[model samples]
Target: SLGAKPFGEKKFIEIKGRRMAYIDEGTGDPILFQHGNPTSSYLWRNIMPHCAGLGRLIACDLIGMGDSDKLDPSGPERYTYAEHRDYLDALWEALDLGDRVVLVVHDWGSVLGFDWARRHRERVQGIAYMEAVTMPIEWADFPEQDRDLFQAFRSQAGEELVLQDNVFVEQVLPGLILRPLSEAEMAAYREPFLAAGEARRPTLSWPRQIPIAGTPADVVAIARDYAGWLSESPIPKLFINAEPGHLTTGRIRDFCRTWPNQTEITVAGAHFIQEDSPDEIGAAIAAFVRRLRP
Candidate 1:
């Protein structure tokens, strides 16, 4: 389904135990990009290039997403947020990353990236995020229609929508972008999991982890925990809000309010802001990181 190689040279590394695919380009301070579920390293194609000359830009597919290895959807552990986090930790260890680097995260990337920064603050240079999940929210925390949308994903109906119907590749992806993706662009995103029903579990599981009904206790805790760390961390942070941020929000509005060292920037685009505003996202991060240079 991912009949596309849109980016330049791709590389592989033995991460933890699986041979992982990633894009490591440029030279200088390491600037890692961690993508979320249902999307791969491909998600950063447009955005990362903008910051190429400023620092190293690397992005990877999560364990079961993109071109990376897939796990047993019916195994002792089906796809879940904790599994994704474990895989990320091992991948980071295998890479043997240097002391400090810039981290640019989006979607679930915000979850792992912020969590990583919280635990390893002394080793972080800065952080930039957009279209991300910043804090734990209850079902009612969201507006009426929003709650219905989230609940559907965590149900049997949701399973059919993502795993069987490919709503993310169909409805979600196209709907979030201000402009619909071209056939080629859409194919590239769908290519990886083509005919891989088992592989679809990751995509389906990601939405279920939203903790709307207080299910995944850790995911909610992670959001709450990171809020404190992000609020207090002295490291520089840049938040690229997508059209009022999260299509409208409570925590992120507050997230912007309390950050002592963060620069809150607004970019006009939908959830997948990278599609319409890659240059803006990249330019903002480049300038933000460069300002940290001694």
Candidate 2:
């Protein structure tokens, strides 16, 4: 009874050689919600219904997350940031949601969603974000303590933890400065990582992909380009950042400032803003969408 259909109703589409699961519900202009690591489409469960009356809500489990098929370790090549963008592209094409769409993105969803929007600027109508990494131009924005924690997770020692423990879901996640989850909600976070080491694929790789400015692994170049693209496009953009959250911070304030038509709001919640403040987030989204109409 969670989704328009029953919870965990299965629907798959082959995208770049892997079967991806997604839920398409309600009707009107499309508002596609992309979730981040350690969470499946379930992340949007509480928030989706609020917007169902406004438009068709399509939420999908990214590869190796949720009910979707796991990544083929043999196809490790398919797990990079670029590959994730391409995978989303395939999904968009398969669903024929090419234009006149709004995107709701969070966390790593920023990379996939922004990358695709940059490539297809005309197709994107608006965006509402919560605690998502937008422009990556300033990698030094991360504090030393946070960087050390991330480095540890990307190290051999961290790999051990990833393989043996659900720290990404249990400790690291809940410990982040944000709203705490309930027993049922905490269990929902743990569901995807039930298979031991499988959860590390998305969690560990996300930090490593941070494009440090001027470094050889300057992933920031892509982000900077997208930022420029967003500035040029007159699309309505709303950034709902979590107070004291990791991904969307004051740094992103400068990033979105250059955009012509963008609004930013600070919300009281943790990394998973939807889980923590669904009513506020939902109301903000509804208002943003309504303002976009003629």
Candidate 3:
């Protein structure tokens, strides 16, 4: 059972007085996995095992989510997109992963990975991404059926759906994954936000940070920057799409095809494709990394 599988022993490093949790395995150039909202490094449990000896596989829990330390709501860093990026920057510096680093990313993690690659192109070996934030997404870009609900997420009601009820980990997560998640699996996702309310602020910030109708101009700008970099960058890229992905829809897939230096693969699942297609995703990433190695 995937849920029964452990992601290896977690290690923590202090970044700006806050501890960021991560799992480091194997040896060689680093293969780093960064997850999005509502998931921790545990998201890579099943996927990482398949990549054994590929490199020093490191999956990190983004600050304020997963096993990472949370910020004080009363403090200045209230989980804004830039704040998250800054914290990630600290973790990146602390880890000091040398040149030849490969990145495996999903969801918002894709934006983070691509942004770094744009700035540090020479250090990044390649990138493999799924359900990623590849372009500037306007409000209408989303599937019509799911649009209204996401609109609510951006509205005041988000406090209820995400901060209070924790729908992101409970309803939205399972609903997006085509298969049923075992109780153990769901429990792991739920652990961080068990306090709910302010503790779930990170989840709320992510949806609102989505570049919808240019509302969050900063994020829209970042998306645009990465899209431009991705279009021209000659680094090897692997784009993995599922049968009916929620974020990586057909239109996005078509757009990604236009980017240079890319290889595409199709798996089976929905939004959280990792839950249903871990094996396929794992094998594909392993193969991609192999091709990049020598």
Candidate 4:
């Protein structure tokens, strides 16, 4: 019901009781795709087709942030990082993605995807990631100019800025994409967060959950643990970096360059590389999947 043309039809399956919306295409072992905060499975619409015929392409909305069902407003879970991770774990179980699945992920999706890959190491065949959160970030690691803005998001002011005004969807997102989004594209991104209250919670929760300065001890631990796996895992990896990158820039970029069994592809874009480099992103993943075990 959410995606427009070129997004195909969205399919739904119940993970626990709530419905999870996704796009299922092609055939053979699954090549799972995951998008990050303030975005839905719609983010992968343009990119998925390029990998057509490589394997089954499955991109699901992360719980509350997409067309997928949001949790109860008064529920115990506050849409924290762990909460999203748990729901995703359930989604994976319900989907039965099986062994030898490939992963294509971005932003916070990379954190969840990498965690899944580490836990299911034997089941994962390969992973392709961009703007990934590979490790706990120091405040210093954040881009200098954007630090104050990011810090604000982690403060009390974030409540009004993110939840009430929907700044993440309205401002932060569009600004990060490099290319301007059409009105419809922007509207689609705004749809899930349009509701006045709880519907906007997930978006706000994401910025706060960012593991900076090791404050959110749990997420920091998760980042460190998964990073350990990412560093040593022999699985084929595709690190798609862009000009003027965000999360995966600077030191993280240099460190990732040393990761084993990795192939790096530099593209033209900024943080939300999908909008600017869908062709390159899709072609790269298609090639990566083709080389996987058949």
Which candidate gets the maximum TM-score versus the true structure?
3
Best by lDDT: 3
Candidate 3 colliding pairs: none
Candidate with better TM-score, 1 vs 4: 4
What TM-score does candidate 3 get on C-alpha atoms? 0.96
Model 2 per-residue lDDT tens digits across residues 1-294: 122222335579888788998988877788888987657788877677677678778888887777676776723233567666667777878987857899999877877788788888888889887776666645467644467676676567665656577667777767763665667777767776777664456655665566655432545777777777876778889888776666666666566666778887777776777666777777788788877754
Q: What overall lDDT, based on C-alpha atoms, would model 3 receive against the true structure?
A: 0.85
Compute the lDDT for candidate 2.
Answer: 0.71
lDDT of 1 by residue, 1-294 (tens): 112344557787776567777777877778888888568888778777667677777887788777777774343247678888888878876765787788989888888898888888888998888877777766655645456666788767976777778876667777777866777788878877676466677777888887455678988888789878787778888888777445335654565557778887888787777777777887888788788765
The segments of candidate 4 whose C-alpha lies over 4 angstroms from its true place after superposition are 1-6, 74-77
- Per-residue lDDT tens digits for candidate 4, residues 207-286, read 88888998789989998998887889899999999998887898777777777999889987778888888888888888
Error of 4 at 134 (Å): 1.1
Deviation in Å, model 2, residue 282 alpha carbon: 0.8
The Cα local distance difference test for each model comes to 0.75, 0.71, 0.85, 0.85
TM-score of each: 0.92, 0.88, 0.96, 0.96
For candidate 3, which ten residues in a row score worst on lDDT?
Answer: 72-81
True-vs-predicted CA distance for residue 76, candidate 2, Å: 6.5
Candidate 4 C-alpha RMSD relative to the actual structure: 2.3
RMSD of 1: 2.8
Clash counts for all predictions: 4, 2, 0, 0
